[PDB]
């Protein structure tokens, strides 16, 4: 009944580490005392329900706050000038000066200027009044209420799902593909065609009249006759103004491509057609697997048969079905890797192809969103690899994977790790050397000696996609090619203009700075992969510790014997690779932010000139753009960016405090706590007040965790401020 | 209304979390 009820070992633990480790292993349900697989799965299911309810509550809170305290209605009239308000500020610590400064956005109270793009998203989606946002918040609140009740219900005795149902892979994948992806995307396309395109074209479609108003003048007669080109006929004109009927068409499903000229975002007809088609594909693919009707596929059979001839990949994929369906960590790793790749994809695609009206001219929101999603992508990738390592050290069965495609990975892990080391070494050596060459050459007053490699291959991709300033004249750039001619009446007439228009972030012009920074990004990705892959492959054992699987995933060490065994557990591989995830995402975000600040400000010949050397990054990006942030508050007064300056210094302080736990280790602090225990016990008066848990220094893995925590939170706070405040102060 | 920030922010961010910290400490120091 003591705090770690799930772990009787921590229950008998008498020191203060009991509380730390109980909180830390609260959610490590697999290793809890007296745990069975069925109970584990049911608990995971209920926790998923609660988590979904949290997500929808967060969404409803954002919606309600913008409805109640935000200037959504005023912003709708003038999207490009009025600054969106996130929520009102309630702070008794604010002075009169801060009150006047934070009173902004055309309201009489202090407020926070939204940098999440929710205003643009909802305006594009079809929200026009605070009432719609409030009703959305109410409905999401009801949804979360139902999800919480469902989570409670699915732990009851008569309503507790079984392990066979949990492990029913075919039905789950069929339903997720067909309905969760497919029918939900179909629902979104229907929403667009019924509510968003009419609202963009100046029609108020809501629940009271969406049943009466026809999305298309012809109705479903074209859909049933098969003359679906009537839904593309009469597209929106280039003189269309978003939210008004002037210049508005009647088409509901088009493939115009490019961007809407006024809003510089893709056409809602194009997006509706996208979601409709993509759903067709997914609803088809959700009929792949066999579920209670004979017709379909058997995933175990597929994996078993996929073994190439003559044992090229050993025994092929035999046993992989069993390992994946038995081990939740492998499923978690696959999910995290896929979702991290998808997060990187959305980060790369939203800025290049904006979808929300007037987002492109909102420079702060774009940078905030890109940085946000790139960081989360990095975290998801690190988690995918960490859970792969946990699977290897906890759930991997060599008897099942005898001569398997997965076992051969462990078989030639030495080759894999050595070659990842080679490529990381080459990339870092050469990228750093070229950067230093450029640094010294510009330093010595002779920039002509800079070694500047043109990214010819990326430029060739841009030319093949439609760029023409490079003059390569290949594929779509060459109007005559089969690629350019076959698609010349669907999307190219708009895409060509969009890509060759220099006012867009679609396929930005690139140069030697882009070459060098891309090779740096390659170095970051390769080294992070090296650390993570090595951790995963050596989690089971090593020449320095062949029996590591007995110790498990996260243990402090093996002692000073055999030369020392620091950070050998393959959890410390994750903890090391987290630094590199932060490093490479920071490089990515610095590249994005500087190139986009230059492009938005209209001087791309600052990035093209200065980015070739590192002092250009240190001066024309960091030092130059740090002035509006650090000048948030000074001796003469304060501005509305004082919060960003304070949070900038805050992230610096946390990043610095992490170095304490990372550098100084447990013995010093343990002995110091012995001294403090002596003092407290020996002083009078205070010694009547006595602890219950014996105070001890933080454990080794605990302190590694705390130091990495302080590092990461620090990273994100510092760049968030610098990316949100410098953009605001420069535009 | 404009009443509700004053009523709710301090109730929810001084009183409730202090009570939660008290409850968690008392609970983890049981038996």
């Amino acid at each position: 009944t003591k705090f770690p009820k799930f772990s009787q070992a921590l229950a008998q633990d008498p020191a203060t580490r009991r509380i730390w480790y109980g909180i830390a292993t609260a959610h490590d349900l697999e290793s809890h005392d007296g745990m069975t697989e069925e109970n584990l799965y049911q608990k995971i299911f209920a926790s998923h329900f609660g988590h979904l309810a949290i997500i929808f509550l967060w969404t409803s809170g954002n919606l309600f706050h913008v409805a109640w305290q935000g200037n959504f209605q005023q912003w709708v009239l003038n999207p490009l000038k009025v600054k969106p308000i996130a929520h009102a500020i309630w702070d008794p610590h604010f002075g009169q000066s801060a009150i006047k400064a934070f009173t902004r956005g055309g309201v009489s109270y202090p407020v926070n200027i939204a940098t999440s793009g929710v205003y643009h998203w909802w305006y594009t989606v079809g929200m026009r009044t605070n009432e719609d946002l409030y009703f959305g918040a109410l409905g999401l609140l009801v949804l979360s209420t139902t999800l919480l009740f469902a989570g409670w219900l699915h732990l009851q005795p008569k309503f507790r799902p079984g392990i066979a149902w949990f492990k029913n892979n075919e039905s789950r994948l069929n339903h997720h593909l067909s309905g969760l992806f497919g029918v939900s995307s179909l629902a979104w396309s229907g929403h667009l065609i019924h509510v968003a395109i009419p609202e963009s074209r100046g029609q108020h479609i809501r629940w009271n009249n969406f049943t009466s108003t026809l999305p298309h003048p012809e109705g479903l007669t074209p859909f049933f006759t098969g003359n679906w080109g009537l839904y593309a006929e009469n597209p929106d004109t280039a003189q269309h103004i978003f939210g008004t009927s002037e210049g508005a068409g009647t088409a509901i499903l088009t493939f115009l491509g490019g961007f809407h000229p006024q809003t510089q975002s893709m056409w809602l007809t194009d997006i509706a057609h996208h979601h409709l088609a993509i759903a067709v594909v997914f609803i088809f693919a959700g009929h792949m697997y066999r579920t209670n009707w004979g017709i379909g596929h058997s995933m175990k059979e597929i994996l078993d048969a996929h073994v190439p001839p003559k044992g090229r990949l050993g025994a092929g994929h035999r046993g992989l079905f069993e390992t994946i369906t038995d081990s939740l960590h492998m499923q978690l790793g696959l999910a995290l890797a896929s979702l991290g790749v998808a997060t990187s994809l959305v980060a790369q695609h939203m800025y290049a192809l904006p979808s929300y009206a007037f987002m492109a001219k909102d420079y702060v929101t774009q940078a905030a969103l890109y940085t946000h999603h790139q960081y989360i992508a990095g975290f998801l990738m690190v988690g995918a690899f960490a859970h792969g390592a946990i699977f290897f050290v906890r759930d991997y069965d060599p008897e099942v994977n005898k001569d398997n495609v997965l076992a051969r990975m462990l078989q030639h892990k030495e080759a894999i790790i050595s070659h990842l080391s080679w490529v990381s070494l080459f990339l870092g050596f050469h990228t750093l050397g070229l950067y230093i060459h450029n640094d010294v050459c510009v330093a010595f007053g002779t920039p002509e000696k800079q070694i500047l490699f043109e990214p010819v291959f990326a430029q060739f991709i841009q030319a093949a996609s439609g760029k023409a300033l490079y003059g390569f004249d290949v594929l779509l750039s060459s109007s005559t090619s089969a690629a350019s001619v076959a698609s010349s009446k669907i999307w190219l007439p708009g895409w060509m203009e969009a890509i060759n228009s220099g006012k867009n972030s679609l396929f930005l012009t690139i140069g030697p700075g882009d070459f060098l920074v891309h090779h740096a990004i390659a170095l970051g990705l390769h080294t992070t992969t090296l650390i993570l892959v090595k951790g995963a492959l050596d989690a089971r054992g090593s020449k320095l510790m062949p029996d590591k699987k007995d110790f498990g995933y996260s243990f402090p060490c093996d002692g000073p014997g055999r030369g020392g065994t620091c950070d050998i557990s393959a959890w410390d591989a994750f903890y090391l690779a987290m630094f590199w995830m932060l490093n490479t995402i920071s490089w990515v975000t610095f590249y994005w932010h500087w190139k986009h600040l230059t492009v938005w400000g209209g001087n791309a010949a600052a990035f093209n000139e200065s980015s070739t050397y590192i002092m250009g990054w240190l001066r024309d990006y960091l030092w130059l753009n740090s002035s509006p942030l650090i000048n948030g508050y000074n001796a003469f007064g304060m501005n509305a960016q004082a919060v960003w300056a304070w949070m900038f210094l805050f992230g610096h302080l946390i990043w610095a405090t992490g170095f304490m736990f990372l550098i100084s280790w447990r013995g010093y602090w343990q002995e110091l706590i012995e001294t403090l225990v002596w003092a407290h016990e020996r002083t009078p008066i205070a010694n009547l007040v006595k602890w219950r848990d014996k105070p001890v220094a933080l454990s080794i893995v605990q302190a590694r965790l705390v130091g990495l925590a302080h590092f990461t939170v620090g990273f994100i706070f510092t760049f968030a401020p610098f990316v949100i405040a410098s953009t605001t102060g420069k535009f | 209304a404009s009443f509700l920030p004053s009523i709710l922010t301090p109730v929810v961010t001084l009183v409730f979390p202090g009570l939660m910290f008290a409850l968690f400490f008392v609970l983890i120091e049981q038996e």
Binding site: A53, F64, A67, L141, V142, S144, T145, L148, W152 | -
Partner: peptide
């Protein structure tokens, strides 16, 4: 303009959700 009654109704639904959250936390704790 969101009304006082609207805010109070949303707050009531939020309180119902809170009660359900305590229940779900209990049932996950057992």
């Amino acid at each position: 303009m969101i009304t006082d009654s609207q805010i109070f109704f949303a707050l009531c639904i939020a309180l119902t959700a809170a009660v359900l959250a305590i229940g779900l936390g209990r049932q996950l704790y057992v």
